[PDB]
Amino acid sequence: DEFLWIEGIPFPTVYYSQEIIREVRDRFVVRDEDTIIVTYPKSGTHWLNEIVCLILTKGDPTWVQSTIANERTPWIEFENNYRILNSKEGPRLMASLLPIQLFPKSFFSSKAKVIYLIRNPRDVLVSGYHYFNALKQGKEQVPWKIYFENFLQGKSYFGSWFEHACGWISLRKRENILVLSYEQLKKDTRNTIKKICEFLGENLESGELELVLKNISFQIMKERMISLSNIEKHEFIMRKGITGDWKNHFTVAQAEAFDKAFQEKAADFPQELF
Ligand SMILES: C[C@H](CCC(=O)O)[C@H]1CC[C@H]2[C@@H]3[C@H](O)C[C@@H]4C[C@H](O)CC[C@]4(C)[C@H]3C[C@H](O)[C@]12C
Ligand SMILES: C[C@H](CCC(=O)O)[C@H]1CC[C@H]2[C@@H]3[C@H](O)C[C@@H]4C[C@H](O)CC[C@]4(C)[C@H]3C[C@H](O)[C@]12C
Ligand SMILES: Nc1ncnc2c1ncn2[C@@H]1O[C@H](COP(=O)(O)O)[C@@H](OP(=O)(O)O)[C@H]1O
């Protein structure tokens, strides 16, 4: 079995259960002062996690060097993390990968802050292809064009990227959530991190801001991270981290097919972010 089907959504086989998903959706309370990072896989989740954690530490890498992403911002749906986050007081820093139909319903009646990271779905496809083939054995790997077809038909972890992205950015103009793109993070870096500083209320000044940028660059973040693969292919999430790698993978035919499927599965989607 490639996936575990929970609420009509394909999940990874390990780390997730239906009962937990249901509980998280129906009973986990999102408290007004909470702040949650919500992404789709291979959109730059580790990058944004590190962005936020370096903003909070004002550039001091020590925390992100000593810890992994799930220790800093525990994923709500991940494992039995909900027990921990329920049995914890104060303002909580959490993360998530679910589409809105599975996000905790309580959040829709609160001023909890949510940062939604989006990426060009083609680069998302490419990053996922490389990462999921990254450490499988040659015979058991997935050829490019069948992974491409599976992505276009929603046979991907946490369901269709189109449904996920559409449902999440349909709430964009709410005050308590803001969307931002991996491309924005890659080229309009300083403006973007200052905007998320505004949104999170975290005050940060000169020097510390230069520190954050330097520490969030791909190269030295990669050196940091290679310093632990119990639940991730630790060696393999830092691939090359540019924008537009899909042009090196998509044939013209595949690009036209992708644009077509994008235009009926996400007709109500403007690409101003990319
Ligand atoms: C196991 C699964 C697929 C890996 C595979 O193809 O074998 C991978 C793909 C997306 C991953 C998740 C994403 O990387 C986001 C989270 C990052 C944290 O560092 C670990 C938990 C975290 C929630 C990851 C858990 C697990 O490693 C995931 C769920
Ligand atoms: C994530 C963890 C929560 C464990 C707990 O108390 O339940 C706690 C333990 C120590 C915390 C850190 C320490 O409190 C020191 C830092 C100062 C501020 O509290 C926020 C960032 C700061 C870097 C914290 C980040 C995070 O909240 C930490 C790392
Ligand atoms: N500091 C960083 N700066 C720029 N891009 C980064 C980055 N860290 C990771 N990326 C890229 O974000 C992708 C993985 O995202 P996620 O955390 O959701 O798995 C990868 O894309 P690529 O495979 O295209 O290189 C990764 O290289």
Side-chain angles (χ1 to χ4, degrees):
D1 210 350
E2 268 189 324
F3 311 97
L4 205 169
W5 289 89
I6 310 176
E7 303 288 306
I9 299 292
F11 278 83
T13 47
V14 54
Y15 313 122
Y16 303 103
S17 95
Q18 160 178 228
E19 169 197 15
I20 298 200
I21 298 299
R22 265 169 212 287
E23 168 99 23
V24 164
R25 175 189 62 187
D26 296 338
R27 299 181 272 297
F28 181 87
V29 303
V30 179
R31 294 196 302 264
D32 268 22
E33 312 92 14
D34 292 329
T35 58
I36 310 161
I37 309 179
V38 176
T39 73
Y40 193 86
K42 316 319 288 177
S43 301
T45 310
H46 297 86
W47 194 17
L48 180 51
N49 184 286
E50 218 124 329
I51 304 315
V52 184
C53 291
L54 279 167
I55 293 190
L56 308 195
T57 194
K58 300 189 190 301
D60 204 311
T62 309
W63 188 27
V64 295
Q65 315 178 136
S66 161
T67 67
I68 55 172
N70 192 50
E71 299 167 313
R72 321 180 212 111
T73 80
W75 268 256
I76 307 187
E77 69 270 15
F78 186 74
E79 294 201 317
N80 289 110
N81 278 345
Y82 81 92
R83 295 202 290 245
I84 301 303
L85 302 166
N86 271 347
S87 311
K88 181 180 181 181
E89 280 326 300
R92 299 176 297 178
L93 183 59
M94 320 205 276
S96 192
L97 291 167
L98 308 107
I100 58 171
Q101 74 263 21
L102 293 192
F103 207 68
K105 295 166 181 174
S106 77
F107 158 77
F108 305 128
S109 313
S110 46
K111 69 175 83 69
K113 274 166 269 151
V114 160
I115 298 173
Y116 186 74
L117 179 58
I118 206 176
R119 192 186 190 182
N120 185 304
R122 305 166 184 91
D123 288 330
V124 172
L125 196 160
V126 171
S127 193
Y129 167 75
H130 276 293
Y131 179 77
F132 302 134
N133 276 341
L135 194 53
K136 296 181 162 33
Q137 51 275 63
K139 273 78 177 174
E140 194 76 84
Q141 297 178 3
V142 176
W144 151 254
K145 52 190 67 61
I146 63 165
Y147 185 88
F148 176 90
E149 196 59 35
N150 280 341
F151 191 100
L152 273 64
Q153 281 155 17
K155 303 270 164 213
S156 190
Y157 288 151
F158 309 96
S160 159
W161 182 96
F162 303 120
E163 293 181 341
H164 190 108
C166 288
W168 266 111
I169 61 155
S170 66
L171 310 188
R172 161 189 40 172
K173 290 180 72 162
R174 276 205 189 190
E175 166 203 51
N176 50 336
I177 74 166
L178 84 166
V179 310
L180 82 168
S181 73
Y182 175 105
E183 293 73 32
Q184 281 174 340
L185 282 180
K186 187 68 177 171
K187 315 203 181 85
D188 199 9
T189 77
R190 166 180 314 246
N191 174 344
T192 312
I193 70 166
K194 294 215 280 183
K195 181 162 153 206
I196 78 176
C197 274
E198 205 205 23
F199 173 85
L200 288 189
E202 268 289 329
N203 288 104
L204 201 161
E205 64 197 24
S206 65
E208 293 167 349
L209 183 138
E210 291 304 321
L211 200 44
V212 157
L213 296 163
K214 170 215 206 210
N215 291 329
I216 65 181
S217 77
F218 179 92
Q219 206 40 48
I220 58 168
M221 181 180 162
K222 181 182 166 153
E223 313 161 3
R224 214 145 70 205
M225 190 171 254
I226 202 65
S227 69
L228 279 81
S229 181
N230 45 298
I231 56 167
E232 261 174 346
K233 313 185 166 104
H234 208 58
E235 305 281 292
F236 282 100
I237 56 177
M238 300 307 266
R239 186 172 62 94
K240 60 173 68 179
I242 70 170
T243 190
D245 205 21
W246 68 277
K247 298 188 164 177
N248 290 60
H249 297 66
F250 282 35
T251 73
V252 187
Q254 290 165 146
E256 313 194 314
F258 189 100
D259 288 27
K260 188 174 178 177
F262 190 52
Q263 171 55 29
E264 77 259 15
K265 295 200 171 295
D268 46 323
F269 199 103
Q271 299 198 184
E272 77 270 15
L273 299 166
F274 312 140

